[PDB]
Symmetry: D2
């Protein structure tokens, strides 16, 4: 018994294992778009109903007011560009194709439509390729301020802005890379680490505590609660966070705060280094493949690329002069 993991981005077509009258028919229709999708395809567009846009507007408006005071700098910066380039506005639900093109140009992240909640292994495996499995459906109009399902609103307002940051995109990918071929017990630990970071994480920004977690930036009640005096805020430690018990019904009683994203990424790399695996993995951004470093010769193959990059930088330093250049 040894677990298979994708080694090519197209192999994510095999990583579709899901955790489980008018509204139900619409939900069947949007799920069919996701089931038909194959890597490489343009993400199909959804013509959202007036009720669906009204549901978006309520969520969007309420949370936007809270962002200035509670959201971290990286989320606010990206949210601004998304309002400028990806069609983020109160009267319009953004299209995944527009958002995927934005992320691709910024960090190399791309979106994939998904029918629903993926198994932890397949979700983390996708992140190894800088692919975010996104839902296109929207929650019921009866309960807009609460949703137990990651609906479109959750994804676009909570998960996407942070993926536009180079450091956070590397962190998200690093969790994904660590999961490849890991045991179910370590997938539970990485899924828990993801929960107290990507989902409900907090960060220190110029002596102030801000929210960066998708579950917080997509929930009005939890965004207020996380920065209030009610919860127990602890320093970010990957080992402490991975073994921390949690629930998904009420607000989180414990939140983990990181010094910076760069430091959290360094902490995660140390945690990932003490994961029981007889090999390591390296992402090939050219082919969007996983290189399994399972021998000294596999390491030398990858080292050749790093050596060429250093040659580029050495030549750059020799080319740099005191003269101020004029580019057309």
């Amino acid at each position: 018994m040894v677990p298979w993991f994708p080694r090519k981005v197209s192999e994510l077509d095999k990583c579709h294992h899901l955790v489980t009258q008018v509204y139900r028919q619409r939900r069947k229709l949007i799920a069919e778009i996701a089931f038909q999708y194959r890597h490489g395809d343009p993400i199909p567009r959804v013509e959202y109903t007036a009720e669906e846009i009204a549901t978006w507007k309520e969520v969007y408006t309420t949370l936007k007011g809270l962002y200035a005071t509670h959201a971290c700098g990286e989320h606010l910066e990206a949210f601004a560009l998304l309002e400028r380039f990806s069609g983020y506005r109160e009267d319009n639900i953004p299209q995944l194709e527009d958002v995927s093109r934005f992320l691709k140009e910024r960090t190399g992240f791309q979106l994939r439509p998904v029918a629903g909640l993926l198994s932890a292994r397949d979700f983390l495996a996708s992140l190894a390729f800088r692919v975010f499995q996104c839902t296109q459906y929207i929650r019921h109009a009866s309960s807009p301020m609460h949703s137990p399902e990651p609906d479109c609103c959750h994804e676009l307002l909570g998960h996407v802005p942070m993926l536009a940051d180079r450091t956070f995109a590397q962190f998200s990918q690093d969790i994904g890379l660590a999961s490849l071929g890991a045991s179910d017990e370590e997938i539970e630990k990485l899924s828990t680490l993801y929960w107290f970071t990507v989902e409900f994480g907090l960060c220190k920004q110029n002596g102030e505590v801000k929210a960066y977690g998708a579950g917080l930036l997509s929930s009005y009640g939890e965004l207020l609660h996380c920065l209030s005096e009610e919860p127990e805020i602890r320093a970010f430690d990957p080992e402490a966070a991975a073994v921390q018990p949690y629930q998904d019904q009420t607000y989180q009683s414990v939140y983990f705060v990181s010094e910076s994203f760069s430091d959290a990424k360094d902490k995660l790399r140390s945690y990932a280094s003490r994961i029981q695996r007889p090999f390591s993995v390296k992402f090939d951004p050219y082919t969007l493949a996983i290189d399994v470093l399972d021998s000294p010769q596999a390491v030398r193959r990858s080292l050749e690329g790093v050596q060429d990059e250093l040659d580029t930088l050495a030549h750059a330093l020799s080319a740099i002069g005191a003269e101020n250049l004029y580019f057309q």
Copy 2:
């Protein structure tokens, strides 16, 4: 003033300046000149290319029975010559395109299928182009690992000879070599060296490209094999290049860049490289002595060009290299 160059893969939409040579409208010696059907088809396929914008799926062309018969003639004749004259990297890739990209005598392959193949193998991708691009725009595209590819086919009257780069030339000559990691890096390296260079330097790099990517030879286990696109796509020249008629010289980037040439008859002089790895190392040394007050680095994540023109620009690129080395250090502890 440094000339404008693309810094994002989408900016290749602005790099569409075409060369006007052996044109079916202008040249009365063109085989298709008096063929109104051929000329109409050529107008149609060019319009597909002009409409194309980065991000679009590459349009499919339904080729006529006459067009498939032309493909079949070229494909069959050249395939027979490949076992004895083609280099190992071409033969290996050709066999993989046959089985995964629809390369077969009774079918012209589609650029979308080929682009997906090349992407998975070396990160190269295709873009439809109306015809031959100016040296600057063609080399600028290579800098993003983009190959500007035609979809039209040569007139049915002259199948064994075509001075224009039709889909037979592109698919049989250029594409199999782009499936090799080392050759794909060599081709991107010529492209990166061209970005914002003088016209004089572009002419030198175009001339270097001609003796490597178009008409290059390589030493494979003491034997001389062909790797150039102009040779692997021409029955006549593929035979000529390995005969005792032409003058074969050792590959030197400075010698090749200043060597005069013509595109009418077969090449009289060819340059042979020890290996592709060595040719790339020679190229690095040539590119290092190019007059440029900055350098460039490809970002394969966003398919962008990072202009390294300051110490802060160099640190930002060094950060990535530092993270890659951290990965490799953890790998060595995992193998331990």
Copy 3:
């Protein structure tokens, strides 16, 4: 920019001393009224003044009184080490006992000790007349040079000495400098000081005091002593691990601005998670030091390379590129087969 040495031989110019504790200037010194002790101090100081980089360190023939003082200091502290000293100290102490002549009836010679440290971490000693000014002391550490005294504390007060006598240097400083990580940390404080303002040297000197001099470390959940002043003082070694002092987490910015005294024991101590982590913390502190250049040590020529231009950085990058070529060959040469070396 203040003058700083750029060649190890230029440490011959970094000999500015702090005299406030000397047996001839301080009234409260145990040797003050001892004309014999003061004469001997003058003699051993002359050995240090005559010394020029490259010279073998001259040997001192210690008197029976001086060996008796060593014996008292050595014996008492050796008993406390097993329970209070950090692992790196204990490991090195055992090796110095067996290779550098560390025993109760013999004062070790600096030449023997310098050869030991050279082979272990590249650190070397040079005889110094007394306590050097913060700038000169730190400047020497940048070259992996430890300015070491050869004199010994007065025989009347063997359990306390406010000056860095040979007991302090050999029992306190030397064992920790046999560790590659700690040697790197010591050199890193040294490199950070080169051409820094007097205000920044005062901060770096105070950082040194609460690390190399009176620093504590977490070793498998327990708190151990690594500070030279702790490991060479029986009283201070007991006190630092007792319930009396205030132990704080190591933070370079907090430690550098923390006030202190040199009369009684330290009321506040700083504890580091590991030496590797303390070095990383120091690297961050040193990065936010006001300097219009950076420095890199050349271990081949024992020189300081001032990285003040992109051309300077690419010259240093060439070396790193050659080192990576070495590692790439090794990975291609390595096999699964278990080698037999004669």
Copy 4:
């Protein structure tokens, strides 16, 4: 079994195996054979070298007036030829030794002074040696940036020719080039390649050394100059190497390593390198295809050899490189 090789600079005390070639006791064709005074002096200077143990100060030799007169003849004659025939790196270093290491016609320089000069310049240092060391021990020494150096001087009867490596040969031929950073790296690289290699490989690297360090030529601004120690220490061969008589070939490590040679007359074939930087890159490629199930990395702090024979050994060394890159990244942000 991997042959024993030193892993610490002190272990060079065990790398003292000498060759017996043109010996004043055994060879009756030696100029000093019938000279009992010369033979006694040679015995004396060899005893200084035999007493030497790593860590010792390099002993000084009080040279006789006859010995200084022999030095003067060799020094003067060659110095006149250097301006036109020597490479830039030798000329630059020669001028610095004249001013700092006591290089002058009326004085034989002391190895203690020369070693201190080289240490400050490229990290190279010297050791006194009784005579010519076996190829394995000599190449092993180079791996630690140690040059094993003789202190004796050729017989006064034959000053313009000496088939043995005396002080004139070492100091005039070998030392100035070791003051160049690139050339010092090239010499160490040949030495590191040899550690624990087969005898067949030692013979190849020994021949490579002959066509580079001993009799190499280099292209300097379109001109061919001499950098080889056997050339820069011989008036006759320094003239010959740049004349139209010899066959000059492009430097190729594989071609040079298998090229046959003799030590009686002047070399008929010479190898010319584009630059020292390029020759080092060529040598790296050659060394990469040497049959050794491990590699070796010098630790300049402890002057030790780290045997990279496992992934753990490689990540240990990679840690240092990673720290160096951190330094350089901060430097770029500071400017």
